DNA sequence: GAAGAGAGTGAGGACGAACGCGCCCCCACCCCCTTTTATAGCCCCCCTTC
DNA sequence: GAAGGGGGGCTATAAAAGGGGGTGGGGGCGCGTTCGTCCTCACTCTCTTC
C-alpha cells in the first residue's frame, strides 16, 4: 500500500516515477504495486492524469549525463512524435527512451542502448522496436535550431 | 622419557650461540630464494684490545651490515625447539647478543620510505567521484531475490492433503523418534497442510503445558 | 510405531466400530486384522492384553473379549439426568458440556428436554458447565432488588461499625 | 553498693514476586493458486548469423 | 564470442469453484530488571546478678 501510494503522490505532483523505479526501492514487485496503485484509486474516489513523455525526460537524461540540448531536442522528439502517432499505444517511457537514444546519438554524448534502457528501466529491445518506428521521420522530429554533431542521414539503422 | 621430556643434551655440552637482530630487507631478500644454501658470509675481526663483528651481503643476493654487540649478563636466554614429531630438545644457551645496523644513512631512508609506501597499499582512503553515481536503485520489475523465491514456491506447490490412514502411520511411525513434537516441526516431517493435521492431531493427539517453554502438542493420545 | 503407534490405530478402530453400532466384543487378533497390524510384536499382544485393554475406561472385559463402554458414557436423557444427580449428592462436580455432546449423540435434545433441571455456567472460553438443579430451596426474586441489594456496600464497613448498627437501631 | 547476655531500636545488605518486555504461538481474515478467452505491449530465453 | 531475430512468456479483464499459504491481531507465556520482604549487624538500657 505505502508503495502504491508513494507512486501514487508522485503522480498527483507532477514528478511521477515509473511502476519499476518505486519497485527498486521497494521490497514489492512491480504487478502488486499495480494491483494496489488501482486500488486506492478506487478507495479514494481520486484520478491520477495520464503520464506524459516529457514527465521522465530530466531524470532520465539527467541520470545519463547527457547536455541540456540534448535534453530539450529528446523532449521535443517525444512530443511530436506522440503528436504525429508514430508511435501508437507505444509505452510513454518507450518512447521517451526512443527519443533520447535518437537525440543522444545525434550529439556528441552517445549513450548506448543498454545504458538508456538501464535508467529508464525499459529493455533494449523494446526502445529498438520504438527506436524504429520514429527513425524514418528523424529530421521532422529533430527542433529546427538544433546542431547536429552526427547527422540526421547518418543516424543509426536498426 | 615420556612426549613431554625435553632433551636438555645440548645444555649438558653447554653449547653456545649468538642472538642477533637483524632488519626485513636483510630476511627479506634471503627470503626470496631462501633454498641457495648461500645468503653471505659473517665476518669477525679481532684485535690486541677490541674486537669488531661485520655482515657482507653477497653479491648475488643484492641483485656492508656492521655488527654491535649487547651485554648478555642481565638476563638468561635459552634456545629450544619443537620437533615435528613431538620431541622437544634444547639447542643451546645464549652467550652473545648483537644487533645488525645500516651502514648507509642518507639513501638508506629512501628504501625505508618504500617500504613504509608498500605497507600503506592495503591502506585505502576515501574516493572522490566526479560525477554523481546513479546506478543504484535501478528500475526492476521485480527483484531477483523475489522471483527466484517465487519460482521455488511454484515449482514445489502447495502441500496436498494426504489420506487418513497415510498421515496416522507417518505421524506414528515417528513418534519412535522422540516424545513430544512441535506443531511447526511436526508439519515439516508429515508434509501436510496446518489445517488438515491440527484435526487429525486433534482426533487423537492432545497438547501438553509445558512451564519450561510453552505448551506443546503431545502424540501420545493417552 | 513401535509399542506406541500400534495401540493408537487399535482405539481409534475400536471407536469407529462401536459407531457402526456393533457392540459384539472383539478379541485381540481380530482387532488387529482389520487394523493392519498384524505383525505387532509378542511383548505388546500380552501388554495390550495386560494393561492397556484393561486400565482404559472405554475398554470392557465380557466373556473374555473386549467391547465399547457405552454405558459408562451418556447416550440417553435419564442417564444425563441421573448422572448430574450422582454429582451433586456426590459433590463431584460439574462436566464440561463438550464432554456431555461427544457422549451423547444429539446432546440438544436431551439438554432442552430436561430444561432448568441444567445449570450452565458459561466460562471464559465459551464452554459450559453443566450442574444438576436441586429443586430443594428455591428463592429468585426480581433484578431491581439485586440491584438495591448491590447498592448496600459492606465491604467497605469494619466490623465494630457494623456490629454497633445493632444496637444503634436496638435490635 | 557495683557489673554480664539479651533486646529495642537504628540502620545496612541479599533474594523473591511482580512489572514489564518482548519471544513465541494460535486464531480469523484475506489472497493466492487453477482454467478459459480475445486483445496489445513489454519482456526474457534460446537459436542463428556473422 | 557479439548481436539480431524468433519463439515463448508476463500482465490485465470477468466470473466461478475449493483449499493451501501468507499475514495482522490477540493471548498465554518465559526471561532480564526493580522494589519490597526478608535477613544481618553496631550502639546502647535492663533485669538480673554478684
Not at chain 2, 582512503?125 to 523475489?146: C, E, I, R
Request: charged residues 30%.
Amino acid at each position: 500500500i505505502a508503495s502504491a501510494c508513494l507512486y501514487i503522490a508522485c503522480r498527483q505532483e507532477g514528478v511521477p516515477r515509473t511502476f519499476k523505479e518505486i519497485c527498486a526501492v521497494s521490497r514489492i514487485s512491480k504487478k502488486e504495486i499495480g494491483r494496489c496503485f488501482k486500488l486506492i484509486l478506487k478507495a479514494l474516489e481520486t484520478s491520477v492524469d495520464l503520464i506524459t513523455t516529457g514527465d521522465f525526460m530530466s531524470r532520465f537524461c539527467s541520470n545519463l549525463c547527457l547536455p541540456k540540448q540534448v535534453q530539450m531536442a529528446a523532449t521535443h522528439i517525444a512530443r511530436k512524435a506522440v503528436e504525429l502517432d508514430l508511435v501508437p499505444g507505444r509505452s510513454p517511457i518507450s518512447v521517451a527512451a526512443a527519443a533520447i537514444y535518437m537525440a543522444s546519438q545525434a550529439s556528441a554524448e552517445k549513450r548506448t542502448q543498454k545504458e538508456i534502457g538501464d535508467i529508464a528501466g525499459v529493455a533494449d529491445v523494446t526502445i529498438r522496436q520504438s527506436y524504429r518506428l520514429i527513425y524514418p521521420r528523424a529530421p521532422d522530429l529533430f527542433p529546427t535550431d538544433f546542431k547536429f554533431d552526427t547527422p540526421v542521414d547518418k543516424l543509426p539503422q536498426l | 622419557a615420556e612426549r613431554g621430556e625435553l632433551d636438555l643434551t645440548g645444555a649438558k655440552q653447554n653449547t653456545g650461540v649468538w642472538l642477533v637482530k637483524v632488519p626485513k630487507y636483510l630476511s627479506q631478500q634471503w627470503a626470496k630464494a631462501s633454498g641457495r644454501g648461500e645468503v653471505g658470509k659473517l665476518r669477525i675481526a679481532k684485535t690486541q684490545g677490541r674486537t669488531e663483528v661485520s655482515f657482507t651481503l653477497n653479491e648475488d643476493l643484492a641483485n656492508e651490515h656492521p655488527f654491535v654487540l649487547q651485554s648478555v649478563g642481565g638476563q638468561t636466554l635459552t634456545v629450544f625447539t619443537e620437533s615435528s614429531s613431538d620431541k622437544l630438545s634444547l639447542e643451546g644457551i645464549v652467550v652473545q647478543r648483537a644487533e645488525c645496523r645500516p651502514a648507509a644513512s642518507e639513501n638508506y631512508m629512501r628504501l625505508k620510505r618504500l617500504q613504509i609506501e608498500e605497507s600503506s597499499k592495503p591502506v585505502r582512503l576515501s574516493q572522490q567521484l566526479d560525477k554523481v553515481v546513479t546506478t543504484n536503485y535501478k528500475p526492476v520489475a521485480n527483484h531477483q531475490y523475489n522471483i527466484e523465491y517465487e519460482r521455488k514456491k511454484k515449482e514445489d506447490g502447495k502441500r496436498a492433503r494426504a489420506d487418513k490412514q497415510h498421515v496416522l502411520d507417518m505421524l506414528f511411525s515417528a513418534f519412535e523418534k522422540h516424545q513430544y513434537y512441535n506443531l511447526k516441526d511436526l508439519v515439516d516431517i508429515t508434509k501436510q497442510p496446518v489445517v488438515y493435521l491440527k484435526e487429525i492431531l486433534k482426533e487423537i493427539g492432545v497438547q501438553n503445558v509445558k512451564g519450561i517453554h510453552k505448551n506443546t502438542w503431545e502424540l501420545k493420545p493417552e | 510405531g513401535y509399542k506406541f503407534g500400534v495401540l493408537a490405530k487399535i482405539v481409534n478402530y475400536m471407536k469407529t466400530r462401536h459407531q457402526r453400532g456393533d457392540t459384539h466384543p472383539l478379541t485381540l487378533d481380530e482387532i488387529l486384522d482389520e487394523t493392519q497390524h498384524l505383525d505387532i510384536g509378542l511383548k505388546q499382544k500380552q501388554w495390550l492384553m495386560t494393561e492397556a485393554l484393561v486400565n482404559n475406561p472405554k475398554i470392557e472385559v465380557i466373556d473374555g473379549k473386549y467391547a465399547f463402554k457405552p454405558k459408562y458414557n451418556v447416550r440417553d436423557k435419564k442417564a444425563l439426568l441421573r448422572l448430574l444427580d450422582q454429582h451433586d449428592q456426590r459433590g463431584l462436580g460439574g462436566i464440561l458440556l463438550e464432554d456431555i455432546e461427544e457422549a451423547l449423540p444429539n446432546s440438544q435434545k436431551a439438554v432442552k428436554a430436561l430444561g432448568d433441571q441444567i445449570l450452565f455456567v458459561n466460562r471464559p472460553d465459551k464452554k459450559k458447565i453443566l450442574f444438576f438443579n436441586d429443586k430443594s430451596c428455591q428463592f429468585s426474586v426480581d433484578e431491581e432488588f439485586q440491584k438495591l441489594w448491590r447498592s448496600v456496600t459492606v465491604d467497605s464497613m469494619d466490623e465494630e461499625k457494623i456490629e454497633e448498627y445493632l444496637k444503634r437501631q436496638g435490635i
